[PDB]
Nucleic acid binder design. Structure first.
Length: 163
RNA sequence: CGUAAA
């Protein structure tokens, strides 16, 4: 819908193919999970710049999955295909400051108030996930757990949603 | 200096 490629699948022959890191963190509270964001907040987006432009400026550093732009308020939300890629964008992209864009973390998944925007993850208690959120966490195309059921301690990358 | 759509 807001994706570049709406119907794509996360499979070896797709050049956008990515693995789905799942680890388990013993220090999480009972019935809590950890979700690393793939969503990026970009601000200072000039008025002349569009969705395809933003995608292309990040091309060197990361392959872009989706772009919700809001030209009037000068911001956009850009999901990239992997957490590794997002982290690379936050360090290396626009390191000189030639472009007017500023890159900070964003929240694609779970409650907003569970997110650490400095480090870029959410520690979410499972009771604050909708049936939908629990569904997408396991069944998602990019990110998620890919079939591993949700349990205390589980850590995964931001799953794709339906909107 | 703008953190949203479900």
């Amino acid at each position: 819908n807001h994706h570049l490629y709406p119907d794509e699948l996360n499979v070896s022959n797709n050049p956008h193919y990515r693995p789905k890191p799942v680890s388990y963190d013993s220090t999480l509270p009972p019935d809590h999970i950890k979700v690393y964001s793939r969503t990026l907040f970009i601000g200072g987006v000039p008025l002349n710049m569009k969705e395809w432009d933003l995608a292309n400026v990040l091309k060197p550093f990361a392959e872009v999955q989706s772009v919700i732009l809001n030209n009037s308020r000068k911001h956009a939300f850009v999901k990239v295909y992997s957490r590794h890629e997002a982290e690379n964008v936050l360090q290396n992209f626009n390191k000189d400051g030639a472009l007017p864009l500023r890159t900070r973390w964003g929240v694609g998944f779970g409650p907003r108030d569970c997110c650490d925007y400095q480090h870029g993850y959410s520690i979410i208690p499972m009771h604050r996930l909708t049936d939908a959120d629990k569904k997408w966490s396991v069944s998602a195309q990019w990110g998620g757990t890919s079939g591993q059921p949700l349990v205390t301690g589980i850590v995964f990358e931001e799953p794709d949603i339906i909107v």
